[model samples]
Structure formats: C-alpha cells, structure tokens
Target: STGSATTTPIDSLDDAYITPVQIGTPAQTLNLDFDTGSSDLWVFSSETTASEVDGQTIYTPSKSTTAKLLSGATWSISYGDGSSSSGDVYTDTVSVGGLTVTGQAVESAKKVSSSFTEDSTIDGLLGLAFSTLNTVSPTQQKTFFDNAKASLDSPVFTADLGYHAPGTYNFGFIDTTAYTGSITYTAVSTKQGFWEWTSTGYAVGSGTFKSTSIDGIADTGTTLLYLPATVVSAYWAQVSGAKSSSSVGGYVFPCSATLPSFTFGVGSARIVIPGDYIDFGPISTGSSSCFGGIQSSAGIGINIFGDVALKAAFVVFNGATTPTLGFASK
Candidate 1:
C-alpha cells in the first residue's frame, strides 16, 4: 500500500513545516516536523517536566496499552541551529497518512533545549533521514521509512515542499501530475546518512554559470541556504546595499533593495530562484535590515541546500541501493 502526508508551514514562519503523525495504541496524534537532516523519532512526553512542556502536547506511554519499554536505551540529538533533545526509548505503533508501522522505536523527550521548548507548535520530530544517523545508544533504531520500505511498492519517496502552501510527501509511489516536464536525476551519496550530492556549479542572477563542484545536503529541516564564504560573497556583490550584519548575523540589506536571482546547477539542469525568494523578509519589525536567505556555511563544515533552495523545484528523494535525486520545475 502507498501513503501520502500533507505538510503545512507554521504561520508566517518560513523556517519549518509540520505534518501530523499518530503514535501509541489508541493513537495520540502529534504535529511533528518531518526533518530530513536527522534520523530519530522523538517527542515531548510524560517524562518531561510539566513546566518545560509549556504549551506543547505530551505523549504518555504509560497510558497506552501497546507501549513497550526499550529498557536501558537512550537517545540524544543536536541540530545545526543548536537545538538539542535527549530521552528514553519505547516500542510503539506509529503511523503517518495511510501507512502504519508496528514496533517502531519512539524516543520520549526527557530534556529539551529552549529552542524546542519555546516552539509550542511542534510537538515532536519525525526523522526521514537514513537509519544510520539515529542517535540511540546501545543499539541504533530504524527510522519510519526504513521500517516501512520493505512493504512499499518501490524503494522511493518524493518531497513536494511548498513555499507558503501545503505540500505532500508521497511514499511507495510517485505522482506524475505533481510536476512539470521530465525529472532530471543526479547521483547522490549515502555515506553520511544524508541525501548528499554535489552540484555542477551556480551563478548569481543572469550571470555566467561556473563549472565548479560544490558538495551539500538536501535538508528540509534547515531554514536557509548555506554556501561557501566565497560563493556567498560573490552573490552579495551583485546587490548594492547588501552587507554582513553583526546584530542579526548573516548577510543583511535594506528591505527595499533590488535583489539578484540565484541558480543552482544539477548536471545540465539549472534550478533558478527568483530574487524575491532570496529576501528572507525583515530581520525585525520596524527595522530597515532584511536577512538574506543565503548565508555562509563556513562554521558548519558542509553546505546546506535548505528550504530556500528546495522550494524552487519539485524534489525526488530516492532511497534505493544507488540513491539518486530527481528534480523538475514545480
């Protein structure tokens, strides 16, 4: 059987998208962020302090008859944005859309950073990356996709992450009507437990497209596009008011500045992003500075083809032995 899950952006926050998932015996549903950068299904639970839970919903394993403790096992994870969470483990029934998996590992959050605690809209995270990236101790846990792949019609899934509207995540099957034209595919590496690939090169605006290779990961969880310092500097050079900001961090420019377009090369395909999308919106209310969606990836040690870049095209994340990605115009 096939499955499809809808993704919705959180209010005006361009940072993350969320999808509803079901867990436990009677089915306690939670709005989880479907993260492609990590592999650990975790949620705030009864183990969390009531004060720390805040406005977020909690998952209580004790209330579910089907929940089984994975004794002595633990899980801990940290994000690129410095958000972290750690917890104990349980085996439970987990489902998304029309697909269900039994005996799935579920991490119950015991400790969470302020970044997660403050975001009451997100009750948990449903990791979609490879199972090797799972943070469980003693023995690593398999992700939802890993557990369900065997029963799927095919070993592939597609991500349709929209700009400001609802999108879809299709499992087992691909929708032919979701995209336009032919899908241009490129080989991807699974060595790092991520959907990583190297682009041929990129160009700012209508400038010449260089033929240099740049390695990066397709991360739906990340908010902004991160590139090398030199590449970032080159892009900003096209804008007159663009400058690095110490107050807000990253590159910033006047809100009204005329921005240049960005294009990424995958094989012979050129994925172009409009200038307006590069303007990440105002840094603060009543402020003249607006944050650039593209930033330097120096400290992270890896470039990130984040939401800003992914939303420009329809993406296919294949999970076969020889994993590859297919891109097409939306």
Candidate 2:
C-alpha cells in the first residue's frame, strides 16, 4: 500500500506544517502537524476543556461508530519549548491520503498548553517517530506510521518540506522527480527514538568545507536550524553587524546586512541552504534588527536539523530493520 499527502506551512514564517488526516468512521477530517521528533498521535477532542480550545477543529470519538476507548490508557507529552498536552486514548480507523490503518491509537486531548490553544491553525500533531517514544501509559501505542509500515511497499517515507510553499509527504516510495542528484544515505540511530545521524561537517558560504563529526536529529516539528556554537558563530561572523544577543534571546543582525549561505555534509554529499533562508525575519513588528534561523544548540544538548534545513533538500526516512536516512538536493 502507498499514500501521498500535501503539507503546508501554517504561516509566513513556516513555523509549522499541517497535513489533513482522516480519523474514525465516516472520515472526520482535521489538520495535524506531522512531527518527526516525537511519537504520539494526539488531537484536540470533545474531551478538551472549552477554555483550552480555540478555533481549531476537534475530533469527537463519540460521533464515530468505529471509535473504541482504550480503557485505562492515557498519554501526556511535554515539548522542549515547555508546551504540553495530556489526554485519554482511543483506537479508531485512521487514514492518510490513500493509506488506511485500523485500530490506530488516537490520544484525545483533554488539556493543552496556552501555546497550543493560541495556534488555531494546528488541530493536533501526528507523530512519525519510533513507537518506543510513544507517551501512552499502561499500554504503549504504536504510531500510525509504524502500524502502516508493514503494508507499505518499501517501508519508507519521504519528507519534501517547502519554503513558503506547499510540500509533500509520501509513503511506500520515493518520488525521484522531487529531488536532484543521487541520494546520499547515512546510518540512523533509533536507540534515542529520533532520526539521529552524524553530519560530516559544515562550511560558511563559499568557504572550505570543515571535517568534523556533528550528531543531530532531523526534526520536522522544529522551526529553526541549530548547530554547535562554533559552527553558528562562524556562519554569523561572515555577516556584517551580526552578534549573539542575550536581550534578543539569540543571534540578531541588521536587516540590511548581507547574510552568508550555510552548507552541511551528509556522507560525501553536500546540501547548501540559501543565504536568504537564514534571515528569519525581523525581531519585532517594524524593527530593523532581524533574528537568525541558525542558532547555537548548546542549550538543547543535541543539534537539530529542523525545517530550516529540511526545506533545502528532500529527506527519506528508511524504516528497514536497520534504519537509515537518505538526503538529496532539490
């Protein structure tokens, strides 16, 4: 079996990407963020408190004949940004594009943080990470991708994230036309429950490529690119009027400054991110100072190759017994 779905940025900043998903009998549709960093298919539902609900759509299990409560099962997750959600669990028919899975565990959110309530564009999140990371209690649940992988032609999925445009997520096959050049494959470590791999090194715009081993995760849920302080500082140094500021909470620079592009290595292949992509936008509504899309990952413990980097290339998550990741320029 195979499936393909369109994913669009929620806002101009490409803060998050949302994809339509069908859940339960009669097909209740909702827009969900496809997060590769976490594993728990959670959604806002009838069980959610009115105060926590905004304009987002809700999934009501009671309205679906196929929805069955996963009695004594519950889940809760907290993101690095401090946002959190908790809910009861239900098993229902879930579909994405043309692929369908029966008895997919769905966590119905009863409580959500303020950040979630304020983001009306996202109804919930569909996790694509390993099942070991699932937050369900009493009995853990497998993610939709895990349950459907057996039926997938090749047990693989690809993410083609876009910059200020619509992208695509494909299951079971790789769309060769979506990318350019030959793909470079690298070993992946799922022991940490993430698509973690080691990057060969990086270079700041037109500079010599450095040979250093940097371990990081390909996190579609995150918005920015985070690397070691040394790498981040080198990139920012190429831009005039750029500096790391505690007051602004990160590296910021004059909006008019010419930024340098960033390049990172995947095995022998190199992926280059445009200079304009690093200019994340103004720090304030009408300010001349702009924030950077690349930041130091020192505080986060591990580097993150988020949307800022993913959008520059096509990524393949190969879910074979010994998982691997594939990257190619597009």
Candidate 3:
C-alpha cells in the first residue's frame, strides 16, 4: 500500500537523479529517472536497436511471463531539451521499493535519442506527471503512482531531492522527519498536465522581496531553475563578474565569484536556495567560467522550478480529487 525509494544524483554536478525500479515476472531491476515533467513510463529494452544500446541495462519482456502486449498501442515523447524516445507498449508486474502494481504499462523503447543512449546511468524514465500527458495512442496509460494511489494510505507522494547525497521518494504518507516547519499548501493546475502553481515572488540574496505573481511548474526532470529574464538578470547582476554569454548559451561568471542566495515564496512560506547550489558548474571541462543554476525562461515561454529549486525544499504532490502542491523547508 506504500513505498519508499532512494534517488541519487548521476554525477557531482547533480545532472540528474535516478532510482531503481523492478519490472516483469522475475524482477528485472533497472535504474530510471523519476521525472515529474513527463508522463510516459518508458524503458530501454531488448527491442531497442543494437547501436543504441550502450552500457545501460535493458528490460527484456520475453523473460517475464506476466508481460502482455497492448495490441496496436505505441508511444512517443520529446522533451524540452529535444531528447526523445518511442516504443511499443506492454503491461506487466512492476514494483518500486516495496509497492507493487499488477499490469502497469511498461513501454519498451524501440528508438532512443543519442543523449539517452549515451547516458549509462539511466536505463529509462518513469513519469510522475498527470496521466493526461501520456503519449500512448488509442488509450493513455496511467502512471505507476496513479495506479498505486488507490491502494496507498494517502493519495500523495513526496520528493526529497538532495544536493550531493541520496534523496528519497515516498508514497502513501509524508515522512514527518524529512522536512522542517509546517507545509504551505497551494492550488495546482493540471490542465497543462504539469504540477503548475503560482509563486508569490522572489528575492535575490538579502534584497527586498518583489511582490509579483510568477507561474511555473515544479519539474524534477529538468536540471536548472528557469525564471523570467528580468529576474534572472537581477540575480546575475549581483555577482561581480557575471554576464550573459552567447558562447556559453547562458549566464556565466568567474568560477570563484561569490554568488548570492535566492529565495522564492510559496503561499506564505519562503524557501531559500543556498549560494553554492546556484553555482551550477564549469561552462566546459577545465574552464574558468561557471554556468549559473538559474537561467532565463523567456524563450521557453514558461518558468520551471527544476532540481535546483526542488533540492532546496521538501515537495509534496497531493493527488486527491482536488490536487494541490505542498512545500516545506528541509
């Protein structure tokens, strides 16, 4: 009825977080990115082309007696970063941590982008967004969390992403010890198939808090925090050597620059992101310039509170009849 799983960053810069998931009859364990930005539970599988197969583990449906083809069904998805994957569908016994879901849709990848193929750390992605975003044809399949909700003690899940260490994903109930202070709940709009919510405003370092509404989605799949260009500029301006570089494709500054902290409001709560967290990493290998964790979302047309922001707090995805998001400091 409930489950708990550990998610770890793939590398030092915390490029992405991945968790172990068990699929099929005999339990084929594969590490997958638990993405809240998309809605298709797809995996690298035996059906994938040989050339696309690197060192990542593959899920072989033939080895699972419980696997059943979803006749004529297919799925395809492309991310904001332009990476994509497509495949046929299969229903099988899938488990995460200690929770089990019989006949969960397990998409088998037949094609994958070079980015995915090259990433040996992750075998697939398990979407946690609303089922409405599922790309499967004919009939959209439910996410593992959606299917497991009915049996859970509560129709909710929590994301506790860490900076450099391992974090946790909890289903059914909130782990009181994972966070500090009371949670601030806010309304969520699922119309766009994302955990979209409005932020009260933001403040750069110890500066004044701007009282404006900023709408954005809490996306676990994305790596950086993206906000309005004006806001991003304000933050970068506070740093002595920061500048927007066309060559770097984002704001970059001296690696040794003393960065300021960032704070955003959720309801009446203010979550502060440490300055070090904003120092994303070097612009390139052995480069003196470092890219910022916060960037402009003007081109994307939507702001995103990605891992950079999520890792600063405890997040609750409440999937009740009326869905809501809860945020708390950790």
Tens-digit per-residue lDDT, 1-330, candidate 2: 999999999998898999999999889999999999999999999999999999999999999999999999999999977899999999999999889999999999999999999999999999998999999998999998999999999999999999889999999999999999999999999989999999999999999999999999999999999999999999999988899999998999999988888999999999999988787789989999999999999999989999999999999999999999999999
Regions more than 4 Å wrong, model 3: none
Instruction: Itemize residue pairs with steric clashes in candidate 2.
Output: none
Candidate 2: where are CA atoms >4 Å away? Answer: none
TM-score of each: 0.97, 0.99, 0.99
Candidate 1 lDDT tens digits, 1-330: 678999888767467888888899899998899888899999999998677787888899998889999999999999989999998999999988889999999999999999888999899998988899999999999999999988888887788888777898888888899988878899898899998999989999989998899999989888889999999999999998899877788899888898998999989988987787788778888888888999999989999999889888888888888889888877
Model 3 lDDT tens row, 94-119? 89889999989999999999999999
Ranking by lDDT: 3, 2, 1
**What global local distance difference test value does model 3 have?**
0.95
Error of 2 at 229 (Å): 0.5
Q: Which residue pairs show backbone clashes in model 3?
A: none
